[PDB]
């Protein structure tokens with residue numbers, strides 16, 4: 001409910017690569033709120049004084065309805081066009097919840113993708129999110 005910003009005015013965000021297992025072969029994407037036929041990596045704005053790892057796990061619970069074991073920070077990713085900067089973490093999913101905030105509120109969808117297929121569906125509208133998987 002309060003947006004936060006880095007010193008250069010980029011919006012602060014956090015997200016997780018929500019993998020099905022420690023193999024990191026399949027990842028959970030969620031539907032775009034604006035365009036539900038498109039896929040995105042779940043994530044969102046850091047609240048004031050919120051640790052990035054805490055914001056990442058919170059936004060994944062809100063948007064994707066999953067919980068799990070937080071892993072490494074992958075990196076910090078800027079979107080120059082939209083002026084935001086996202087901390088991206090690995091999350092190993094251990095709990096899949098049936099009727100989560102965004103399912104109830106906006107009918108948000110979620111789906112498992114093989115990594116190669118996640119990169120494919122993100123490339124057109126979300127190429128920075130496709131890059132999250134590069135390394």
Ligand SMILES: O=P(O)(O)O[C@H]1[C@@H](OP(=O)(O)O)[C@H](OP(=O)(O)O)[C@@H](OP(=O)(O)OP(=O)(O)O)[C@H](OP(=O)(O)O)[C@H]1OP(=O)(O)O
Pocket residue numbers: 003011013031032033034035040043044045046059082084
């Ligand atoms: O105007 P669009 O439809 O492009 O909306 C974008 C975005 O605009 P941008 O590119 O100007 O930053 C929203 O920002 P805000 O308007 O809340 O600041 C962003 O929220 P966010 O950063 O994730 O923040 P949280 O709400 O999750 O904390 C939202 O994601 P959803 O959460 O998924 O609804 C995106 O939608 P899409 O990616 O299609 O699903």
Ligand SMILES: [Cl-]
Pocket residue numbers: 019020021022023024025026027
């Ligand atoms: Cl996996």
Ligand SMILES: [Cl-]
Pocket residue numbers: 079126128129
């Ligand atoms: Cl992006």
Ligand SMILES: [F-]
Pocket residue numbers: 044045059062
């Ligand atoms: F949000």
Ligand SMILES: [Mg+2]
Pocket residue numbers: 043044045059062063
């Ligand atoms: Mg959100």
Ligand SMILES: [Mg+2]
Pocket residue numbers: 042043044045059063
């Ligand atoms: Mg969001």
Ligand SMILES: [Mg+2]
Pocket residue numbers: 001044045059
């Ligand atoms: Mg939010």
